Design a protein around this ligand. Structure first.
Ligand SMILES: O=C(CO)[C@H](O)[C@H](O)CO
Ligand SMILES: O=C(CO)[C@H](O)[C@H](O)CO
Length: 421
């Protein structure tokens, strides 16, 4: 019944989606980020006000809850007032630090043990600033942007906080990390979806929002994209068939594998696990454009195996399901008819998804029940036939894939659906 606002801040831009879930009606507005900037916080915040502005007044007067998802790993170093004291470290930027320095702050093989993690970037900043002031704070993109709305400093969610060192399984930072030099900069971690506080009165009156509107705890954009699908039962999974095949499986058990980068986000009483293969649509685009890809797909009969057996790597190295930094793209033997060649490629990608989900299950995750598909290859029915014959479960196109929609659902209902009974 709630009318909720989902704010999505991703890699290339930002999208706002407001939904009346009672009548199931929505409105969506967009803003495109520059290719690069000199003041990214300014870009993000201006994008925030711009998004709020593009939303109709009749909608804004009825928004009761707001949630924000941001890119994972994009952090900001700020004072007490939330003002950036240096350039933000982006999601894709790595830091040349020694992970052994973070050994006594998180358990072994923790997800925060990565050169691109928020914790590694915090330690990074600590190195060049020498001594970070105790009254300062580190804030993920979503954290900072929501801070622009509710004004409560040092507030984050246990999705963004995971790679900062948070342990969602025991729902805490280690006492070693809390009593460390970085502990004073750490945020208070809440569950994604819960109310942090009311919206700032000035902001509410300025943008014609209700002064009783609640600003909720945020999440990451990939998780929000998963939330867009609506899947909330263990064994349900979302497959993203984009440039790279990305699997996300909902399970009752947290599974992990550091060699393949597999970890688990907490999701209510459940866990969202998954992985990412280097194979994907990019390998297909190496041979055919999209139009030719379709033109050939319409001639493929998935019932009869091509006989070919490819591993559709586009380049050097494979992460998931099996880790091999020196594995070759096996796109041989390439045959006569490009139709059966494309069929072979599709069979390869199919095997990638299959081995992926089966491997996820083998690590202890809840057995697969069904697949919701997103990305460019989602509409490919032949590919879907190969997949749904190889996996063993029903496969359908995800009703919604927009991160902003999943974030709007996060604002409206939180993670309440992700519990036993
Ligand atoms: O750049 C992005 C990733 O898609 C943002 O989510 C933006 O909303 C674009 O739609
Ligand atoms: O948040 C991120 C973690 O790599 C990326 O920006 C990506 O957009 C995820 O969907």
């Amino acid at each position: 019944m709630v009318v909720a606002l989902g704010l999505d801040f991703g890699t290339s831009g930002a999208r706002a989606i407001a939904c009346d879930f009672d009548s199931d009606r929505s409105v969506s507005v967009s803003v495109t980020f520059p290719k690069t900037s000199q003041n990214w916080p300014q870009v993000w915040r201006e994008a925030l006000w711009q998004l709020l502005t593009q939303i109709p007044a009749d909608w804004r007067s009825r928004i009761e809850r707001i949630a924000i998802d941001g890119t994972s790993g994009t952090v900001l170093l700020c004072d007490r007032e939330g003002q950036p004291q240096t350039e933000p470290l982006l999601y894709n930027q790595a830091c040349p630090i020694d992970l052994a320095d973070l050994a006594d702050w998180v358990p072994a093989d923790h997800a925060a043990l990565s050169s691109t993690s928020s914790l590694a970037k915090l330690w990074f900043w600590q190195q060049q600033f020498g001594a970070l002031p105790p009254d300062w704070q580190i804030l993920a993109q979503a954290d900072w942007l929501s801070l622009q709305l509710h004004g409560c400093s040092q507030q984050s969610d246990y999705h963004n906080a995971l790679k900062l060192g948070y342990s969602p399984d025991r729902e805490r930072f280690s006492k070693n990390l809390l009593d460390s030099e970085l502990g004073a900069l750490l945020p208070v971690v809440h569950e994604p979806g819960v109310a942090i506080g009311p919206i700032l009165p000035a902001i509410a009156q300025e943008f014609g929002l209700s002064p009783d509107c609640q600003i909720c705890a945020g999440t990451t954009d990939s998780i929000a994209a998963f939330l867009a699908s609506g899947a909330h039962q263990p064994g349900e999974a979302v497959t993203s068939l984009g440039s790279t095949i990305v699997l996300k499986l909902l399970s009752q058990v947290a599974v992990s594998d550091r060699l393949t980068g597999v970890y688990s986000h907490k999701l209510g009483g459940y866990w969202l696990t998954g992985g990412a293969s280097n194979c994907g649509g990019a390998t297909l685009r190496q041979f055919f454009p999209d139009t030719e890809l379709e033109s050939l797909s319409c001639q493929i009969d998935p019932t009869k195996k091509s006989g070919l057996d490819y591993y559709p790597l586009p380049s050097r190295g494979e992460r998931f399901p099996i880790a091999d930094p020196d594995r070759l793209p096996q796109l041989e033997p390439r045959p006569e008819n490009p139709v059966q060649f494309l069929q072979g490629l599709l069979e390869g990608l199919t095997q990638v998804e299959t081995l992926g989900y089966q491997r996820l299950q083998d690590l202890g995750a809840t057995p697969l029940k069904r697949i919701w598909t997103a990305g460019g290859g989602a509409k490919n029915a032949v590919w879907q036939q190969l997949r749904q014959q190889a996996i063993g479960v029903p496969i359908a196109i995800a009703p919604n894939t927009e991160a902003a929609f999943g974030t709007a659902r996060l604002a409206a209902f939180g993670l309440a659906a992700f519990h036993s009974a």
